[PDB]
Ligand binder design. Structure first.
Ligand SMILES: *[C@H](O)[C@H](C[C@@H]1CCNC1=O)NC(=O)[C@H](Cc1ccccc1)NC(=O)[C@@H](NC(=O)OCc1ccccc1)C(C)C
Ligand SMILES: *[C@H](O)[C@H](C[C@@H]1CCNC1=O)NC(=O)[C@H](Cc1ccccc1)NC(=O)[C@@H](NC(=O)OCc1ccccc1)C(C)C
Lengths: 306, 306
C-alpha cells in the first residue's frame, strides 16, 4: 500500500550521459551506439543566443571543436550534423553501455522520468508530465541542458525528452530526440509564451482511483453524472475534456475498484465545485494530474524492469 | 529554476538487487561483496509470521535452502547467519558490480531514496523522510520486502533502510542494514502502534527557503519572532521543536536569501495560524517537510554524483 510519485530506475540512462563542450559552453549529451546527442545551442555564445543563425554558427565548427568526455574516457568526434534542434556527434567508439532504446515523441498528458545532469554526471531523477501546453514543471539549473526524459518497458528505454530551456515562468521546454520542440517554442533567448495550461482530467481520475485503492474514499459521493454534464463542469475549471477513449483507458481501474467512471466524474465534479474543505487525498491538498492510468496500474500491480 | 522531490540516481543500487527464495517465500536481497542481505522473515511461513521464533525456524534451514538469483546468474550460498532482523547469506562469488558503500543508521527527519523492487528487479525510485515516529510514507506492495533506502555522496552509497513491513496505517517500517528496526517495531504480524507523528520543522523552513529562491515569496511577512515564542506555536501544531542547531543548519540558505531564520519562523507561524487561504507554495497546498536543508541546497547548486 501507499502511493508515491515514482520514477523509473535510472541506471540504464546513467550509462549514456556524457559531457559535451564546444567553445566555452558545456552541456550534457546522450551517448547511444556511436552517436552523441545534445542541444544545438551548445555551439552558441551568450551573445549568439539572443538571435542565432544555427547554420552559420555550425559552419564555423569542425569535429575537433567538440569535446566529448564520458566520465574520464574520450570520444573522438568523426562526424557532426544538426537534426532540427539537436546536434549529432559521430564518435569512433560505440558506447559499451548502450541499452535497448527507442526514440519516442510522447503526447501531452503522458509521463516520463527526468535524469537531471550537470557536466555529464547524474544529479537526480524525478517524474513528470508533458503539460497540455507542452511544457514540463521540472527542476533545472544552468548546465542541465541535454538532460533527458525517458520511460522503460521491461528492458527498452524510450527516450522522449531532451532539456533545452527555461521559460519566464519557471517552466521548462525542450525537444524529442529528433530535436523537434514540444510546443511552439524556438531555441532563441527571446520572450516566448506557453499558453493556457489545463489539468489532465484523465490523470486526475486515475489518481482518484489510486486513492480508493489505498483506502481514501471520502470523496466518493452519492451522485452520478453524464459525460456531457461533466465536460461542462470541466471546461469551467480548465480541465481537458473527458472523452470515451479516456473512459476506456480507465476501464481496468474501474473493474478493480467496482466504481463506474461516471460515478467517479461525479465525485470529481463535486470536488471541483466545493473544493476539498481542508481535507487531503493521498497526502495532497490539491487535485493531482501527473499520474497516468498506466502510472496508477503499474504502482498497484508492481511491474518491474531490467 | 523549479523545485522537485528528487531522488538519487539508482544505477549503483540496481546492480546489487538480487532475488532471495527460502521455502515458498521470495523477497529482495542486497548483494554487496560476497554477502547477500535480506529480511529474516524470508524464512517464515504465513503461519510462522503471527508469532515467529526466528532462532528455531532458522535452525531448520541450511545453506542450500536459500535460492539466491541475480537476474539469471546464481550464487552458491556457503554460509548464513542472522544479525538482528537481517539475514546474511555468504555466497561464493563477490558481486562484480559492488559499489563503494557504507551502512548508515539515519536520524529521524533525514531523507533517502527508495528503490522499490519485486523479485530482485527494480520497479521505481522515490524520495522520503524518516518520520519523527520512525516510519516512512512509502509505496510498497507484496514482495517489496528487502528493498533498500540509500543516499549517495559522490561515489559512495550509504545504505540506510531495508523494508520489512507495512503497518495498519499504510505506513512502512523497516531496519538499517545491521537489521535493527527504526522505531519500536518488531517483525511479527501483530498489532503495532507507531505513535504520534510530528512535522519536521527544520525541513519545512528549508522548503520555505526553497520557495523564496524560486520566486514564491508571498508568505514572507512583516513580522519576526523569538525562538521560544515560535516553539510555543510549534508545539500547538505538533511541529518538532526548533533548536539552535537547526538554526545553524539553515545558515547557508539564510545567507543566500538574505532572510533571517527567525523572520522565516515568523512567516511560518502566521502560516500555521492562518493557513494558506487557498494559495500554494512550490505547487503544494500543504506545508512540506520531506526536504532537508541539504536537499534544498543540493537542488539549488546542482551537486552531482558518480
Ligand atoms: C542549459 O544548461 C540552460 C538551462 C536553463 C538555465 C536555468 N534553467 C534552465 O533550464 N538553458 C539555457 O541557458 C537556455 C540557453 C539557450 C541558448 C540559446 C537558445 C535557447 C536557449 N536559455 C534559457 O533557458 C533561458 N530561457 C529563455 O531564453 O526562454 C525565452 C525567453 C523568455 C523570457 C525572456 C527572454 C527569453 C533562461 C531564461 C536562462
Ligand atoms: C514483504 O514483501 C511484505 C510487504 C508488505 C505487503 C504490503 N505492503 C508491505 O510493505 N511484508 C509483509 O508481508 C510483512 C510480513 C511479515 C512476516 C513476519 C513478520 C513481520 C512481517 N507483513 C506486513 O507488512 C504486515 N504488517 C504487519 O503485520 O504489521 C503489524 C500488524 C498490524 C496490524 C495487524 C496485524 C499486524 C501487513 C499488514 C501485510
Amino acid at each position: 500500500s501507499g502511493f508515491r510519485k515514482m520514477a523509473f530506475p535510472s541506471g540504464k540512462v546513467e550509462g549514456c550521459m556524457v559531457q559535451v563542450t564546444c567553445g566555452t559552453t558545456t552541456l550534457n549529451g546522450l551517448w547511444l551506439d556511436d552517436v552523441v546527442y545534445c542541444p544545438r545551442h551548445v555551439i552558441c555564445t551568450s551573445e549568439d543566443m539572443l538571435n542565432p543563425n544555427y547554420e552559420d554558427l555550425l559552419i564555423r565548427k569542425s569535429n575537433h571543436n567538440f569535446l566529448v568526455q564520458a566520465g574520464n574516457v574520450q570520444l573522438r568526434v568523426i562526424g557532426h550534423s544538426m537534426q532540427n534542434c539537436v546536434l549529432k556527434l559521430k564518435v569512433d567508439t560505440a558506447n559499451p553501455k548502450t541499452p535497448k532504446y527507442k526514440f519516442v515523441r510522447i503526447q501531452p498528458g503522458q509521463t516520463f522520468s527526468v535524469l537531471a545532469c550537470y557536466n555529464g554526471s547524474p544529479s537526480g531523477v524525478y517524474q513528470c508530465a508533458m503539460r497540455p501546453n507542452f511544457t514540463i514543471k521540472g527542476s533545472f539549473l544552468n548546465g542541465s541542458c541535454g538532460s533527458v526524459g525517458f520511460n522503460i518497458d521491461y528492458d527498452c528505454v524510450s527516450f522522449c525528452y531532451m532539456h533545452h530551456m527555461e521559460l519566464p515562468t519557471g517552466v521548462h521546454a525542450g525537444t524529442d530526440l529528433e530535436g523537434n520542440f514540444y510546443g511552439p517554442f524556438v531555441d532563441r533567448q527571446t520572450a516566448q509564451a506557453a499558453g493556457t495550461d489545463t489539468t489532465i482530467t484523465v490523470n486526475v481520475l486515475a489518481w482518484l482511483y489510486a486513492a480508493v485503492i489505498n483506502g481514501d474514499r471520502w470523496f466518493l459521493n452519492r451522485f452520478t453524472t453524464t459525460l456531457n454534464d461533466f465536460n461542462l463542469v470541466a471546461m469551467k475549471y480548465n480541465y481537458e475534456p473527458l472523452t470515451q477513449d479516456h473512459v476506456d483507458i480507465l476501464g481496468p481501474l474501474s473493474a478493480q475498484t467496482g466504481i463506474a467512471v461516471l460515478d467517479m466524474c461525479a465525485s470529481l465534479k463535486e470536488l471541483l465545485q466545493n473544493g476539498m474543505n481542508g481535507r487531503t487525498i493521498l497526502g495532497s491538498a490539491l487535485l493531482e494530474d501527473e499520474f497516468t492510468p498506466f502510472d496508477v496500474v503499474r504502482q498497484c500491480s508492481g511491474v518491474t524492469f531490467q
